[PDB]
């Protein structure tokens, strides 16, 4: 669960919700509006 | 939060510019007469800091 992916040297640390449709997410996780970060199936 | 560092008759002058995540900072310092506006003249400024920071720059504020 620590172990985690989504200019040079850029570091986006923001945790805030991909709009991966038009939807106005809000913060809302479902269909085209996910969290950007996941963690690797170790 | 991935960094942290410690080191009208004045004129002080400075330059920021981001570069490759760096944060580059130059400035200079003279007395002036001339105090309403930028006095018409030369003097280079030089540099002070080269910081490793990696940041998203768009906006800035004075503080006071
Ligand atoms: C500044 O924030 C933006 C997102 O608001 C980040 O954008 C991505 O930057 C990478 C390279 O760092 C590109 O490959 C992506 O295409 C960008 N995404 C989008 C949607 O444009 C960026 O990483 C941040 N920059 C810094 C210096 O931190």
Redesign the pocket.
């Given at each position: 669960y620590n172990y985690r992916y989504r200019?040079p040297?850029?570091?986006?640390i923001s945790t805030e919700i991909y709009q991966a449709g038009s939807k106005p997410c809000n913060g809302v996780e479902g269909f085209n509006c996910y969290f950007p970060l996941q963690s690797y199936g170790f | 939060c991935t960094f942290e560092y410690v080191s009208f008759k004045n004129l002080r002058e400075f330059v920021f510019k981001n570069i490759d995540?760096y944060f580059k900072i130059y400035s200079k310092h003279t007395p002036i007469n001339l105090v309403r506006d930028l006095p018409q003249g030369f003097s280079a400024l030089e540099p002070l800091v080269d910081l490793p920071i990696?940041?998203?720059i768009t906006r800035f504020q004075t503080l006071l």
């Open positions: 200019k040297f850029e570091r986006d | 995540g990696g940041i998203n």
